[PDB]
């Protein structure tokens, strides 16, 4: 945040400006060392937007090892689906090509064939499928604070 002062006359910290405080992308972006660190931060920021307090609560959903809401901040390992299918490969473009990739969304960590919520789908975390009737589908992944 901008306490309107001298602030911004110091070399960014994430941790005093993002993450104890709320901040912009540019005050992310200052505070980090690429484009990239950014984008990937940003995605992760914004899907924990609402799971800010406590710092514990605010850290798990940041490390991503279960879901939050949507599961927007899920950047665990589950790569099957609901239904027991194995993921398709992000980058693979078969048996599906992916209209949702490492360019149209920067940041939301589409590696290997890991479960993702790239576009905020309603049902969570998924993946294409290596089906090829099956575009699609979600998987299951713990939800943050659940049982
Ligand atoms: C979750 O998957 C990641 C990515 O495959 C695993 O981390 C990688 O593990 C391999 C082998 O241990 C290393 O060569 C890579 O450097 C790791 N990638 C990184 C650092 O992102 C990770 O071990 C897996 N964890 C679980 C829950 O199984
Ligand atoms: C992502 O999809 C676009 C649109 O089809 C394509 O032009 C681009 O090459 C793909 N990029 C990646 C990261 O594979
Ligand atoms: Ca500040
Ligand atoms: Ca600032
Ligand atoms: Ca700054
Ligand atoms: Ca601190
Ligand atoms: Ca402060
Ligand atoms: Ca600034
Ligand atoms: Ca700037």
């Known amino acids: 945040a901008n306490k309107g002062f001298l602030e911004e006359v110091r070399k960014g910290n994430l941790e005093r400006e993002c993450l104890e405080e709320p901040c912009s992308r540019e005050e992310a972006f200052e505070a980090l060392e690429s484009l990239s660190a950014t984008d990937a931060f940003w995605a992760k920021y914004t899907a924990c937007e609402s799971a800010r307090n406590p710092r514990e609560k605010l850290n798990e959903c940041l490390e991503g090892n279960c879901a939050e809401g949507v599961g927007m901040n899920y950047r665990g390992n589950v790569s099957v689906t609901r239904s027991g299918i194995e993921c398709q490969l992000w980058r693979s473009r078969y048996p599906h090509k992916p209209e949702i990739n490492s360019t149209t969304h920067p940041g939301a960590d ?9 576009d905020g789908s309603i049902t969570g975390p998924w993946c294409y499928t290596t089906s090829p009737t099956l575009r699609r589908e979600e998987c299951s992944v713990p939800v943050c604070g659940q049982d």
Do not use: D, S
């Not at 589409?110 to 790239?118: D, G, Q, S, T, W």
């Open 110 to 118: 589409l590696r290997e064939n890991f479960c993702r919520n790239p």
